[PDB]
Amino acid sequence: MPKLQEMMTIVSQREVASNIFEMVLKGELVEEMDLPGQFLHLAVPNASMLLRRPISISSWDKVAKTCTILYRIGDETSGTYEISKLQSGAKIDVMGPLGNGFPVDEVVSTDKILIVGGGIGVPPLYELAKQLEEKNCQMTILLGFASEKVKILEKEFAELKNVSLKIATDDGSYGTKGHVGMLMEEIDFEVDALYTCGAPAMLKAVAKKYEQLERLYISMESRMACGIGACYACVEHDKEDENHALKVCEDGPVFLGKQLLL
Amino acid sequence: MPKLQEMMTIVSQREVASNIFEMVLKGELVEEMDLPGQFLHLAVPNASMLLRRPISISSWDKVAKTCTILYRIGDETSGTYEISKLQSGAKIDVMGPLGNGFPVDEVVSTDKILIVGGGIGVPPLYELAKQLEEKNCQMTILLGFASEKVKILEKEFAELKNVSLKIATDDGSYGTKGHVGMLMEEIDFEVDALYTCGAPAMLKAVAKKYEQLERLYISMESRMACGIGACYACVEHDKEDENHALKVCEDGPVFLGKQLLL
Amino acid sequence: NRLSVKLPGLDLKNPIIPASGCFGFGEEYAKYYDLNKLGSIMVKATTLHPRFGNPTPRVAETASGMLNAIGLQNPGLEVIMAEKLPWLNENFPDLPIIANVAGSEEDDYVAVCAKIGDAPNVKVIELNISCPNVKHGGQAFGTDPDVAAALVKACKAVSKVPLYVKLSPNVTDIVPIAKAVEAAGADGLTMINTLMGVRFDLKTRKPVLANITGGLSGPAIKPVALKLIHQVAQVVDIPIIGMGGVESAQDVLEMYMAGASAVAVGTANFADPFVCPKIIEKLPEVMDQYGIDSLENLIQEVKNSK
Amino acid sequence: NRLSVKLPGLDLKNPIIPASGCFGFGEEYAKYYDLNKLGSIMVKATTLHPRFGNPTPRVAETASGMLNAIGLQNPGLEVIMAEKLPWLNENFPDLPIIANVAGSEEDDYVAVCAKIGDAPNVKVIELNISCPNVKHGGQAFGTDPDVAAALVKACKAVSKVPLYVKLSPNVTDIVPIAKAVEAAGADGLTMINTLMGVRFDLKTRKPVLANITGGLSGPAIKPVALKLIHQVAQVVDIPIIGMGGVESAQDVLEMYMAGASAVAVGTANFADPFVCPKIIEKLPEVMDQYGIDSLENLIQEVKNSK
């Protein structure tokens, strides 16, 4: 009970976009998952790389006992690169699930949900749309990527009903040319809750457009070491209590917008 | 041509005695092998362990394109332990063949060959007996082990003809109770060439018993780094030229007894 | 039992102590196992006033190591005495706590050392003299035997519990500093704190740590720790709590061959949260493998070898 | 070309230089690839008289590193001038050789530096001041700015080729020593030599190296090298040949962000004999990945950042 750590089995792994791998993991950590937007602290199969790699949960299947993640790799000296060389059947050392995810309890079919995502911020937003869809609320999902080469999870989002999905690319290679913020300006309704995740400039633009909204949930990143809140590596300044540090791994990864300064 | 290094394929690996693994490797390094008693410089599949592990060649099969090695592992923090976790199909990073092996050219069916081996000194002596057997000389092979638990290559030596094979164990659990040196005293003939390999006390006792014999070939060990003679880690004092260093990886691993001080 | 070791201020059920800065005040890892398994805990550094720490990024990976530039983030003396240590005392009344004490000037160290022994569960103080001194131009107290001996002597006067000094490894010669610190009244030593490293981002060409430089730790530094622990052990009679890159019972035992009496484990907890209980249950089998009686014996056999 | 860098005494076709003690005099690795691919070679230390070196075991593995205690084994000046360097000159007449010079007292260093420039292929001398001085009690020349500046100044007088000094990292503050060495007339610097480590045998309880202590190298020390290279680069104008744990073109480029002009690769050759040609053919693709012009530019962009 509350396992915290487990040698999970890779069900599969394939490269679903340019340098972005989708890994499906089987183990008993999945029964512990609840809120969308928690993450896993993955150990690299490389004894010289001791710090775990933190990667958002994209979706899970409680009955199948599997969860799904989508991550970008670095160059051949990077540790995520090594993770992609693992193959079906291999075990991988996982801590999780970890963090405070996206709240979905107080959402009901009348309020209108906006979801903004970019880059490798998209994966954790997919499980979010799954669990929100069961509340029969109306969703607008705007995703932005650098290029068509790095577009991920389009078919999975399209298949969800109650979804108006728009996709931008910075170069115009797919969908709307430009950044996700441009599509954000173009929405015409009163949003009741916004969930967002992506590169800091995108989070900065989202938080400034909706500074007035209480139900604005922002998913953050930082450099990590311990992953459970003891080493204080991943701090953010608390906007609500100055001099007080928020910890992205334990207090986060998702915060209300009142708590952050960008 | 002269490949020097290769990613070989493990044909198989099994634990043939207590903590002693036999690995059969397939690759084109095998066509380069000639004298018995050369070694391979193996890389550990563990990026934190940069120094290669040097392991004698036990035997090879030129047509099958495979060679065989037999090595002892340390504890779970040891690098050889990691090598034993590799499995059939895996590739392993090999430098070789390396060193000066056992000379066998000038041997002819009339001279009587004595072979002394102990512990994990035994493996390279097996290929030696194979190549000497084709010269139809008469062989006496005396092997000593700590225990029955660590006895290796008995069935392979027994199957060679022109062989009188005796086996000792320090505890008496198999064959003759005691050390290989006891069986060594008990030989009654004039030995023309002696080949030996094993723990330093055993090599010390062998060299002192036959200090008078020119054709006495001793296989040595030392701590290694480069494996090709550049870093000077593995030196022995040259007995024939004082102040001059012999290098176990390049000048050795096998020397004439005149060249060594124990 | 075999694993028990007795030190000044420390009746340890076994020698494993999570290292300062790597365990907070135990509240997080406690969700993962019963802290009573541990011998002790070096809690995070306490400074007199609260400190947010350095700007991020604060950590970076290296080969068999990591860099940290936390900056001594901690809630300060008053909060640590009122919340963090009492919390340990309630949930683990019999678990001895090692109070890492850091500072920016001598008065601050002394002020902390006057109060922090009042906590019932704090049995020892670990003087972290591996900080910058503003009363000296940002020079580290741990690089000048005279100042360091001043600091220890000043702090020795106000402390109700035994005082260990934590040595910095970034020295040319470490022997003058240990001799000086032992003669200033230190009851023990811990070593080592971190070495100094830097990583650069290939994309931005700037250091990856905001602080530019950061402390290097992990198995990469175990040889440096062993060498300086062995060096100091030939020069002082006060016992040494060794640390630096320990990840295994083997590593613990090697620290003993160097002259350590207990072993602190720091960076390793980040890779394996259970590494400290894991090592403790693995220690007796590994001691049998190498014919070792008890750790109390080994300390004496090594001390007499030496 | 992109990879070419020009230094005092050094017109390098690219920046990769096998580090001293890790390449002998090139005769062994030459069986594995055409040495002309290299930018240069720091050959093994030359001392005035022959030296057998230290007793074995001389090396030991560490986490992402190794320990060595070779003891400056080398055939001495007369043999090196007559056999080892002429051999390089015949097989590689256009391949510039960096002559590591070590010693036990000042006269010995000077005597070597007087003769060894006479070799046509020796373009630079790398003063290895990371040795013990018997004219001072076994203290290292590399820890006293006054002595080190004496040694360099004495050696600067007799040398027919530019003189680089190789800095030891085992210092509290490295800045006084580089300032002193640059003011003594050094044309360049190489850094770093090794850190100091120890390993213990669990079975015998004795150090695994006969010499007890040994030099730590490999990727474990790359952060320490980067930090001291960055530290010194803000303090001197003479160029720096950086080394310490380099294994990749990425590692080479990071040395450039620290302020190095060429990169020496030492311990890595033992794991991968082809690592130095491997890195050289891999460098341009990696420079494109991070938008880098030429190494000559990068030296200037980094120098001006700084």
Ligand SMILES: Cc1cc2nc3c(=O)[nH]c(=O)nc-3n(C[C@H](O)[C@H](O)[C@H](O)COP(=O)(O)OP(=O)(O)OC[C@H]3O[C@@H](n4cnc5c(N)ncnc54)[C@H](O)[C@@H]3O)c2cc1C
């Ligand atoms: C809460 C959280 C969730 C995340 N989810 C995802 C995801 O779902 N998909 C995905 O592709 N990426 C995700 N990231 C970013 C991801 O952790 C980095 O891509 C990855 O750790 C980089 O390591 P590496 O092996 O690629 O590179 P290396 O350069 O070998 O990593 C070295 C060290 O630097 C750290 N590091 C370097 N860049 C980053 C970065 N941008 N963010 C965090 N740490 C970094 C690594 O964690 C590691 O500790 C997430 C980050 C956080 C904090």
Ligand SMILES: Cc1cc2nc3c(=O)[nH]c(=O)nc-3n(C[C@H](O)[C@H](O)[C@H](O)COP(=O)(O)OP(=O)(O)OC[C@H]3O[C@@H](n4cnc5c(N)ncnc54)[C@H](O)[C@@H]3O)c2cc1C
């Ligand atoms: C020429 C030669 C041939 C050899 N052939 C064989 C063989 O056929 N079978 C076999 O079982 N063993 C052989 N050995 C010994 C073998 O290399 C060691 O058993 C092995 O390297 C130990 O490393 P490890 O990963 O087990 O332990 P670790 O303790 O993890 O090794 C750490 C470092 O210490 C070195 N080391 C430790 N003990 C020894 C030792 N006794 N000899 C050499 N290096 C050591 C390792 O090489 C490595 O560089 C040979 C040694 C030499 C020099």
Ligand SMILES: Cc1cc2nc3c(=O)[nH]c(=O)nc-3n(C[C@H](O)[C@H](O)[C@H](O)COP(=O)(O)O)c2cc1C
């Ligand atoms: C993230 C981090 C924070 C640390 N914080 C402290 C601290 O507050 N006080 C202190 O004395 N040492 C601190 N250290 C040093 C450790 O206590 C430990 O002595 C050092 O890291 C070496 O051991 P290790 O390699 O097992 O971590 C810290 C180390 C790390 C990695």
Ligand SMILES: Cc1cc2nc3c(=O)[nH]c(=O)nc-3n(C[C@H](O)[C@H](O)[C@H](O)COP(=O)(O)O)c2cc1C
């Ligand atoms: C086996 C060995 C021998 C060495 N011999 C020398 C030497 O003779 N002279 C010298 O200046 N440095 C010597 N060094 C230090 C290296 O030149 C190099 O600067 C140091 O090892 C750091 O780089 P690396 O980590 O890539 O090896 C030696 C290092 C090793 C590992």
Ligand SMILES: O=C(O)c1cc(=O)[nH]c(=O)[nH]1
């Ligand atoms: O808080 C820190 O940054 C810190 C303190 C210390 O003593 N050692 C360390 O490595 N980091």
Ligand SMILES: O=C(O)c1cc(=O)[nH]c(=O)[nH]1
């Ligand atoms: O020869 C050696 O032992 C040696 C010399 C040197 O300068 N550096 C080193 O690490 N080892």
Ligand code: FES
């Ligand atoms: S990663 Fe250690 S505190 Fe967040």
Ligand code: FES
């Ligand atoms: S191992 Fe490098 S010289 Fe023999």
Ligand SMILES: [Cl-]
């Ligand atoms: Cl303070």
Ligand SMILES: [Cl-]
């Ligand atoms: Cl000399």
